[PDB]
From a paper:
The fifth step in the de novo biosynthetic pathway is catalyzed by the enzyme orotate phosphoribosyltransfrase that synthesises orotidine 5′-monophosphate (OMP) and pyrophosphate from α-D-5-phosphoribosyl-1-pyrophosphate (PRPP) and orotate (OA). Herein, we report the X-ray crystal structures of MtOPRT (coded by the rv0382c gene) in complex with PRPP, inorganic phosphate and an exogenous Fe(III) dicitrate molecule (ferric dicitrate, FDC) at 2.25 Å, 1.90 Å and 2.40 Å resolution, respectively. In all the structures herein described, both monomers composing the functional homodimeric unit are related by a 2-fold axis, with a solvent excluded surface between monomers of 1045 Å2 (13% of each subunit surface).
An analogous network of hydrogen bonds occurs in the MtOPRT-Pi binary complex, where the inorganic phosphate occupies the same binding pocket of the 5-phosphate group of PRPP exploiting the same hydrogen-bonds network. Refinement statistics gave good correlation coefficient score for the Pi molecule (CC = 0.97). The analysis of the enzyme structures in complex with PRPP and Pi lead to the identification of the molecular determinants responsible for ligand recognition and binding.
Author numbering:
A (entry chain B): -10 to 20, 31 to 97, 104 to 178
B (entry chain A): 3 to 96, 105 to 178
Amino acid sequence: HHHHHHIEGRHMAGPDRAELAELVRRLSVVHADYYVDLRRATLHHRASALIGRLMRELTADWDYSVVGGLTLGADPVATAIMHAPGRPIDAFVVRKSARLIEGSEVTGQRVLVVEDTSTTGNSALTAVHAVQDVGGEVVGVATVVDRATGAAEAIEAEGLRYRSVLGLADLGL
Amino acid sequence: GPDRAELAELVRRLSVVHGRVTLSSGREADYYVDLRRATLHHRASALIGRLMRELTADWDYSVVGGLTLGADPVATAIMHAPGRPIDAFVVRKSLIEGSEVTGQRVLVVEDTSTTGNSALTAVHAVQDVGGEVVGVATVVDRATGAAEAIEAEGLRYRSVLGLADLGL
């Protein structure tokens, strides 16, 4: 039973989104019945370049100067966004225990929290808590793949905007 | 020339953090070094990726990575910088995540090493799953013996910047 959620990424249809979905299938989906290892894609030279480009487009109407999330999953997503062409965006990392925020300053800034894929939503909310605790303002949460697990709804239930590039249909699942 | 100077300036300004601090050692000081402020900055990280590829251009490797958290933005900066395809990985402590290193030639990276233990922990993790480590590269060497520790294991060690570049 899936909790199907809106994939705002469907509106960015085009060559780059299809190329990424094909990479995610080839790198990350192993046919349990199957399992998914997104880190193979977020740490791949071409999939990561597409992730940075597409996650900027996905969030082009949101105001933020810094991007980051909970280690380890968020980290290559945030750095792909920082490195992608466009306006200057800096990065941070939230540690899982401990200064929980490393990297660029988030105090007084508008921040995008990212994940590769949210499992329960807790990881995103943990990053949000950390940012808000030091005076950052979270504009929303963006992910690469939404897996219809209920995490989206759990995030939105706490007042946060949520968007993803790809959904379960894009994984061939 | 110009790129290396631009980076050294960013590293002094972003990562040599001024102000009175009791260090980890318990000893007081007038600054500490936090390379993450540079490795997670839009321009410093672009320069790091570019200069680290130039620094290791004669080495043959298809994957780059090191011990979390310090190595991670260094490896991804390499991967995202223009040039031939290089994929990335991350070493966790008590396991390799990301791109496959088994059977591959691998560059181990660190932002800055003190003892060399973090980098050698990554080198051993890689070797333990069949990766062949071609060398270790770091953004900043701080003349602390890390180079010697790494070379003592038969590995080449290179850094983009040295302790002189930090303007202390």
